[PDB]
Design a protein around this ligand. Structure first.
Ligand SMILES: CO[C@H]1/C=C/O[C@@]2(C)Oc3c(C)c(O)c4c(O)c(c(/C=N/N5CCN(C)CC5)c(O)c4c3C2=O)NC(=O)/C(C)=C\C=C\[C@H](C)[C@H](O)[C@@H](C)[C@@H](O)[C@@H](C)[C@H](OC(C)=O)[C@@H]1C
Ligand SMILES: Nc1ncnc2c1ncn2[C@@H]1O[C@H](COP(=O)(O)OP(=O)(O)NP(=O)(O)O)[C@@H](O)[C@H]1O
Ligand SMILES: [Mg+2]
Length: 847
């Protein structure tokens, strides 16, 4: 960390601290044979530190800047003006200028034009991007102009905009410096960007060129327009041709000017087809050198391609680490589970450790690998029809994938259920006791035996037979009563207020806990305005508190394990953060009168005796009439016995998960005491095996954890596709509006009825302030989301499928719901009156 200047040829690996990201990648690119990087050098961060960071006024100014927030806006406008003008007034030490004069003559010389380009780094974050944050000036000639523009580059580190960016991304201003790339200008016929993997599709196999005439500054700042071409294998899939009005050109005596292209020139294809393929190959060599897809800037001059920037890509949805060969197709677990939130590795692993599916992981969520199924004759073709009875877009997405570059070459007893339930209740009772004895590596040793027991109650053949009994029977009823009586999706109304549904009870019991809070206005005022996490220990103060805390405590002992994202072991359970239930307990205090759970439940079973006994009567004057009747009543009794249970096995699974979580946090806090972990919940970023070794060996790799931590962040920003490909193509299916109103948003019908109301688009149940009219539009809706179904008039989600909670819960609440809705939360606007049809599956944006 001594030199002031380095030629691209002199730059060693991992020198970002000295030359910045841009400078480093230019250095790297310049050593690839067949790659022409215009000669140049970096004015090092040394020069920056020497000239500026050693200045007492500068450092004082930056020490001040350290103190302010994005809300200290006018302190930002003025302090940064001071810094900027201070920089442009500070001369560059003659010693630094001397070293530069020498290196500049080597590339050469002060009569030639140079690009002067910012290159930033953040200390100890060598790969941190400052893309589009700081200045570049093109075609600068002469020592005077050079020195002037170096200071200008430096000053551009302290625009209001660059400062705000650093504050929001938690970069310390004192630990960011600017190197300056000084590089021979290319005077090009054409220039542009290259993305080694298509930003649509995201398919890791297509390439993409944006190409314009003239210098690249137009395309990037951000007009002119540009040509777009996609090349899939070595063949060109697509060509696009922009009408390119303007082009930027270098002036002989320095600087730059914009010209208007002749009309007949504006529509010409920037690059020939041969040049496009040549560029693609050029580009494939730099991920191939770099190992991950890349973002590359280029110039075409006199038939020669010049590389002028390269930089890792940052947006694509990762591919599963598959240990299989050949082309693979993955199905998304998120969509069927109604989850789609990124999961942490510890939580990711516990789901994997409990499934007999071939599940893999990509981007913090889970995929199932189902290609070998697809390949065989008549098992594909098993699956596509079968997977189409839960999710049409999946079926659609699979047809679309089997057309590629050869991508492809018993009902149990009535008494069954309560024994199933109590045999789980007890299996958990045992569990709760046996871990409070285990600890350390004994804990881990035990969890694995218990996973076997988890699997045993979860996948009990008798349980499954009881589960399907409900599904199968509403399969039968829906198919057959539409066949005879015609016009019917009947099992929706027949399922209404079904008994023993541990998840429908949950949302409906919160109605009662609010009936307890309602009388006491002391507690209601506290609860109305509180962010205190242990507000439950301040209640005994107020007149209602003691009564209230009891009401709540019992709910949490019944449902406290459950939280949104429950499948992820690492997510805060309700009982760990009771304050998240308050706005729902609050707002259905005000939306309901006394005994609302009774009246909602009753009117449901009333409104399904009527359909039962309407359908049965109405079937009597059909041809074979009282026969057809008795076989349906047979299926209704069956239906309404085993529909509750459909939701129990998840509730048993989770209870274990929360019991495991408590135990694993103990070990993690025990790991803090021993000084081996920094943060007690850092165990969320290790998979369950890695975690075993840590308690076992007393060793961790924090440069690993921190990357898990970092990776997690850049998931969350992702949204899993319905289907994922070995190439990382994403396929969400397309729906079929047969004879549905055009201009409608299409989805899966799931729960019957048409209704009109206010759209409330909510991503957090806690911030959901639902009112009587509202139609809830959200992303997923797992059992966690039930308590919010009691005031709304209809439901809309982005993801899901018939027979997958909480689609199953809408039916029993008698709620119209539509489910497979591409981009509902973005397409629909909060507050827009809206009509949902949950019979035919569509949505109309009412005026
Ligand atoms: C269209 O749905 C199917 C997808 C098929 O395709 C296919 C390739 O894609 C899948 C996706 C996307 C999954 O996410 C998945 C899954 O999460 C899971 C099992 C494991 N399944 N079984 C293996 C055999 N064992 C005897 C029972 C467990 C799976 O196979 C799959 C799965 C597939 O296999 N496991 C679990 O999640 C766990 C840890 C517990 C689940 C418990 C309850 C009990 C389940 O809900 C039961 C009630 C059924 O609901 C499911 C089996 C679905 O079946 C139906 C009719 O809906 C299935 C998601
Ligand atoms: N030597 C060069 N010759 C011709 N055009 C260049 C040269 N260097 C850069 N350009 C163009 O001018 C722009 C300047 O890019 P550069 O400042 O290096 O990064 P940036 O895209 O402006 N922002 P960033 O990448 O985060 O630093 C590029 O987008 C090119 O189109
Ligand atoms: Mg750039």
């Amino acid at each position: 960390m001594k030199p002031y200047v380095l030629k691209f040829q002199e730059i060693r690996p991992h020198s970002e601290a000295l030359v910045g990201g841009k400078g480093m990648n230019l250095g790297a690119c310049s050593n690839i044979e067949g790659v022409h990087v215009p000669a140049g050098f970096c004015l090092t961060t040394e020069a920056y530190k020497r000239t500026l960071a050693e200045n007492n006024e500068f450092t004082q100014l930056l020490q001040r800047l350290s103190s302010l927030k994005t809300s200290d806006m006018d302190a930002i406008r003025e302090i940064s003006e001071t810094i900027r003008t201070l920089i442009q007034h500070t001369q560059i030490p003659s010693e630094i200028a001397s070293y530069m004069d020498a290196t500049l003559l080597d590339v050469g010389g002060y009569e030639m034009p140079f690009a002067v380009r910012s290159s930033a780094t953040a200390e100890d974050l060598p790969h941190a991007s400052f893309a589009g944050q700081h200045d570049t000036y093109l075609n600068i000639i002469g020592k005077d102009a050079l020195l002037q523009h170096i200071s200008m580059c430096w000053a551009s580190l302290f625009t209001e905009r660059a400062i705000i960016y650093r504050i929001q991304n938690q970069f310390d201003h004192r630990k960011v410096q600017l190197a300056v790339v000084i590089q021979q200008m290319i005077s090009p016929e054409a220039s542009g960007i290259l993305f080694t993997a298509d930003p649509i599709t995201s398919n890791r196999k297509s390439l993409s060129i944006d190409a314009s005439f003239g210098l690249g500054e137009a395309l990037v700042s951000g007009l002119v327009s540009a040509d777009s071409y996609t090349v899939r294998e070595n063949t060109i899939t697509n060509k696009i041709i922009a009408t390119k009005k303007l082009a930027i050109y270098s002036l002989k005596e320095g600087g730059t000017e914009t010209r208007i292209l002749e009309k007949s020139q504006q529509t010409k294809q920037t690059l020939t087809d041969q040049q496009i393929i040549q560029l693609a190959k050029l580009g494939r060599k730099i991920e191939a050198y770099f190992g991950k897809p890349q973002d590359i800037e280029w110039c075409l001059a006199e038939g020669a391609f010049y590389i002028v920037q390269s930089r890792p890509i940052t947006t694509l949805y990762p591919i599963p680490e598959v240990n299989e060969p050949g082309n693979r197709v993955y199905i998304s677990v998120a969509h069927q589970q109604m989850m789609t939130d990124a999961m942490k590795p510890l939580g990711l692993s516990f789901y994997l450790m409990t499934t007999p599916a071939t599940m893999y992981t990509a981007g913090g969520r889970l995929f199932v690998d189902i290609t070998q199924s697809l390949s065989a004759k008549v098992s594909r073709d098993m699956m596509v029809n079968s997977l189409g009875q839960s999710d049409p877009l999946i079926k659609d997405a699979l047809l679309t994938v089997i057309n590629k570059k050869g991508f492809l070459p018993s009902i149990p007893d009535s008494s069954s259920v309560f024994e199933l339930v109590r045999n789980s209740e007890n299996s958990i009772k045992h569990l709760k006791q046996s871990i409070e004895t285990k600890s350390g590596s004994d804990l881990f040793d035990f969890i694995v035996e218990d996973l076997e027991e988890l699997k045993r109650v979860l996948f009990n053949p008798t349980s499954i037979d009881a589960i399907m009994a409900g599904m199968d029977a509403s399969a039968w009823l829906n198919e057959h009563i539409y066949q005879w009586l015609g016009e019917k999706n009947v099992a929706d109304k027949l399922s209404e207020s079904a008994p023993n549904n541990i998840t429908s009870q949950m949302g409906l019991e919160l109605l009662d806990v609010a009936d307890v809070i309602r009388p006491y206005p002391a507690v209601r005022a506290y609860l109305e305005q509180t962010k205190n996490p242990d507000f439950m220990n301040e209640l005994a103060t107020l007149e209602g508190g003691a009564e209230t805390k009891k009401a709540l405590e019992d709910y949490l002992q019944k449902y406290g394990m459950r939280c949104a994202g429950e499948i992820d072991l690492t997510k805060t359970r309700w009982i760990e953060n009771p304050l998240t239930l308050i706005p729902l307990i609050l707002s259905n205090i005000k939306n309901f009168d006394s005994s609302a759970s009774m009246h909602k439940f009753a009117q449901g079973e009333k409104e399904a005796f009527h359909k039962e006994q309407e359908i049965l009567r109405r079937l009597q004057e059909l041809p074979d009439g009282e026969q057809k009747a008795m076989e349906t009543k047979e299926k209704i009794d069956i239906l309404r016995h085993f529909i509750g249970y459909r939701e129990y096995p998840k509730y048993g699974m989770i209870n274990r998960y929360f019991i495991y979580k408590l135990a694993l946090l103990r070990a993690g806090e025990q790991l803090v005491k021993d000084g081996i972990l920094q943060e007690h919940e850092d165990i969320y970023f290790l998979y369950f095996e890695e975690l075993r070794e840590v308690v076992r060996t007393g060793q961790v790799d924090y440069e690993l954890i921190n990357a898990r931590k970092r990776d997690f962040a850049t998931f969350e920003k992702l949204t899993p596709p319905r289907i994922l490909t070995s190439d990382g193509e994403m396929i969400n299916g397309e729906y079929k509006r047969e004879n549905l109103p055009k201009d409608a948003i299409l989805g899966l019908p799931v729960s019957s009825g048409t209704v009109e109301g206010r759209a409330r688009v909510i991503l957090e149940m806690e911030k959901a302030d639902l009112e009587d009219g509202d139609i809830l539009v959200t992303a997923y809706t797992d059992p966690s989301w039930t308590p919010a179904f009691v005031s709304i008039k209809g439901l809309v989600t982005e993801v899901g499928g018939l027979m997958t909670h909480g689609a199953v819960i809408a039916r029993e609440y008698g709620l119209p719901a539509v489910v497979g809705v591409e981009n509902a939360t973005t397409i629909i606007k909060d507050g827009q009156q809206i009509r949902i049809n949950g019979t035919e599956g569509y949505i109309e944006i009412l005026d």
